[PDB]
């Protein structure tokens, strides 16, 4: 979650 | 050709998502999962550890940006969506901007119009703020999550927007009807955008590449490869000559902008793949940089022969 790049 | 290694010159022994120097490269600030903005004196750190300021926050922090004219002011973006401007002398929040409806990933203070700051969010909006006004000055409704926003270093009329749609959207804020140009090439979300100069823009992506772009002639220039970045925000920092980024192998990578493979790297039991570099920041155009990783360790590194 923290520091994880999003997706669409 | 003058450098082959990164030397550790100082260390401060969780995840730090942002590490940034103030205007004069005298203080630096860290922020992330611990809901605490810490300010350190760079010279003290190199010559020794204790922060000189600590500001508690309500939410986890994604990004910091110091004001370029009011040297004691710093902005943060947080996982609640709030964009805060802080006075590190008084420890008080000066502005709390609350229009974003989801986590804000990025905030950037303009160098040339220092009261202007821009933020981007999972709510798919870019918001431009003025520190003398409570409501946003410009709102750009985009189709996809915004991971990073950055002002052009030479003019507050241009911003680069790194989007989860895999593109960099380059806007002239005087006419947001259409971006000036949308740069395609990355195969995954664009996690960072950073300017080397008025005309040179770099980007990072979870396709394990960095890319260099010409924002004057709207051209791709170069793709950089070697590091591992498929999941996390691992940091990007650039100066006139060099790009540095983290890796999901607990290594920092440095690229010269003219060379596609790294000129050097530094590794910060558990596999390398269990920790990642989470934040990086050059000390302006010098070979010194700040780095932090997912354990919360901070290292000052210097390019060396």
């Amino acid at each position: 979650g923290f520091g994880v790049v999003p997706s669409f | 050709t003058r450098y082959s290694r990164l030397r550790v010159i100082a260390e401060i022994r969780n995840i730090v998502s942002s590490i940034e120097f103030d205007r004069d490269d005298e203080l630096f600030a860290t922020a992330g999962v611990s809901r605490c903005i810490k300010v350190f004196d760079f010279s003290s750190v190199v010559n020794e550890q204790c922060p000189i300021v600590e500001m508690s926050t309500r939410s986890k922090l994604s990004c910091l940006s110091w004001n370029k004219h009011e040297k004691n002011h710093i902005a943060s973006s947080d996982y609640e969506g709030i964009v805060t401007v802080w006075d590190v002398t008084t420890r008080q929040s000066l502005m709390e901007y609350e229009e974003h409806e989801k986590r804000a990933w990025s905030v950037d203070f303009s160098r040339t119009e220092p009261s202007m700051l821009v933020s981007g969010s999972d709510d798919c909006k870019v918001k431009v703020w003025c520190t003398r006004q409570e409501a946003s000055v410009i709102n750009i409704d985009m189709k996809a999550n915004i991971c990073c926003v950055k002002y052009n270093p030479g003019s507050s009329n241009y911003i680069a927007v790194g989007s989860a749609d895999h593109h960099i959207h380059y806007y002239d804020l005087r006419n947001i009807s259409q971006p000036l140009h949308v740069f395609s090439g990355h195969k995954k979300a664009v996690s960072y955008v950073k300017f080397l100069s008025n005309n040179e823009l770099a980007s990072a992506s979870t396709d394990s590449t960095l890319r260099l772009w010409d924002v004057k002639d709207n051209l791709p220039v170069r793709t950089f490869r070697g590091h591992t970045n498929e999941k996390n925000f691992v940091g990007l920092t650039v100066n006139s000559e060099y790009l540095a980024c983290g890796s999901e192998t607990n290594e920092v990578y440095v690229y010269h902008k003219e060379i596609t493979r790294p000129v050097t790297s530094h590794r910060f039991e558990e596999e390398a793949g269990s920790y990642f570099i989470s934040a990086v920041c050059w000390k302006s155009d010098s070979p010194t940089m700040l780095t932090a990783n997912s354990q919360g360790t901070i290292k000052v590194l210097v390019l060396a022969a």
Side-chain angles (χ1 to χ4, degrees):
Chain A
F2 185 92
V4 175
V5 173
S7 271
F8 57 102
Chain B
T1 66
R2 50 191 187 274
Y3 307 120
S4 74
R5 76 214 313 125
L6 277 163
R7 281 190 60 189
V8 182
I9 71 170
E11 189 181 288
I12 312 175
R13 280 182 309 282
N14 43 48
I15 304 155
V16 174
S17 59
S18 199
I19 186 153
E20 297 294 338
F21 278 108
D22 70 354
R23 171 181 72 94
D24 300 323
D25 289 341
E26 295 170 347
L27 306 180
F28 66 93
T30 65
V33 79
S34 77
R35 303 186 315 157
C36 187
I37 301 169
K38 293 180 185 165
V39 181
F40 298 84
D41 184 282
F42 178 74
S43 267
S44 306
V45 164
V46 165
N47 295 339
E48 291 284 329
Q49 289 302 268
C50 195
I52 63 177
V53 177
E54 297 190 31
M55 298 172 295
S56 294
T57 64
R58 192 173 322 118
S59 303
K60 294 190 277 252
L61 304 149
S62 56
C63 195
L64 295 173
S65 179
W66 291 88
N67 191 287
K68 276 72 198 186
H69 192 263
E70 311 307 284
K71 180 169 78 171
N72 57 323
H73 295 187
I74 188 168
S76 61
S77 53
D78 73 30
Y79 277 53
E80 204 184 335
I82 296 177
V83 173
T84 311
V85 176
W86 305 84
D87 184 322
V88 307
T89 300
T90 67
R91 289 79 156 162
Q92 302 311 299
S93 69
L94 298 172
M95 300 290 281
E96 289 171 1
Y97 298 114
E98 302 178 307
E99 299 181 5
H100 287 295
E101 300 183 270
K102 291 179 169 177
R103 65 185 61 180
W105 282 116
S106 191
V107 60
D108 193 43
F109 262 123
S110 163
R111 291 184 181 279
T112 57
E113 221 193 308
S115 75
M116 305 298 295
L117 61 157
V118 62
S119 63
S121 167
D122 272 343
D123 70 4
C124 303
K125 301 179 186 325
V126 171
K127 290 179 181 280
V128 176
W129 313 95
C130 178
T131 61
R132 298 181 297 273
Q133 304 181 57
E134 287 187 67
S136 67
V137 174
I138 302 170
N139 184 91
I140 308 179
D141 293 326
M142 298 183 72
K143 173 155 183 53
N145 307 44
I146 296 135
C147 299
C148 184
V149 300
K150 204 74 172 80
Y151 272 110
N152 185 290
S155 176
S156 66
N157 292 318
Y158 321 110
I159 56 168
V161 182
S163 168
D165 73 7
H166 308 181
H167 315 303
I168 298 142
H169 304 237
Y170 195 55
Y171 280 94
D172 185 336
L173 289 170
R174 299 166 295 188
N175 183 357
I176 61 163
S177 306
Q178 284 289 333
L180 289 171
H181 194 78
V182 175
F183 293 91
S184 296
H186 282 295
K187 315 307 173 203
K188 292 267 295 294
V190 182
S191 54
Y192 298 83
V193 290
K194 301 293 179 95
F195 289 86
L196 290 80
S197 72
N198 293 340
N199 297 338
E200 298 166 290
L201 174 71
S203 59
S205 170
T206 51
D207 66 6
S208 288
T209 70
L210 317 179
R211 290 174 202 249
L212 183 62
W213 316 89
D214 172 353
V215 297
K216 180 168 75 165
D217 298 322
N218 298 325
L219 301 176
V221 184
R222 195 159 297 109
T223 303
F224 306 87
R225 300 184 159 90
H227 63 290
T228 303
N229 178 206
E230 292 294 307
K231 179 188 189 181
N232 298 107
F233 284 101
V234 300
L236 177 65
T237 180
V238 307
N239 63 25
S240 65
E241 271 200 293
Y242 293 92
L243 308 78
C245 68
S247 185
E248 288 146 10
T249 56
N250 208 25
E251 302 166 307
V252 180
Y253 285 78
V254 171
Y255 299 89
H256 190 281
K257 72 179 181 184
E258 301 287 338
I259 300 300
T260 57
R261 298 194 185 288
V263 304
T264 191
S265 60
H266 176 73
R267 316 179 55 184
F268 260 46
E269 62 191 356
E270 274 108 328
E271 271 191 358
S274 292
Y275 297 92
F276 59 97
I277 306 304
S278 53
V280 295
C281 190
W282 290 114
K283 192 169 173 292
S284 295
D285 276 4
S286 81
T288 303
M289 67 174 304
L290 308 170
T291 66
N293 85 337
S294 51
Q295 310 185 242
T297 301
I298 299 154
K299 288 171 149 67
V300 182
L301 302 187
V302 186
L303 283 168

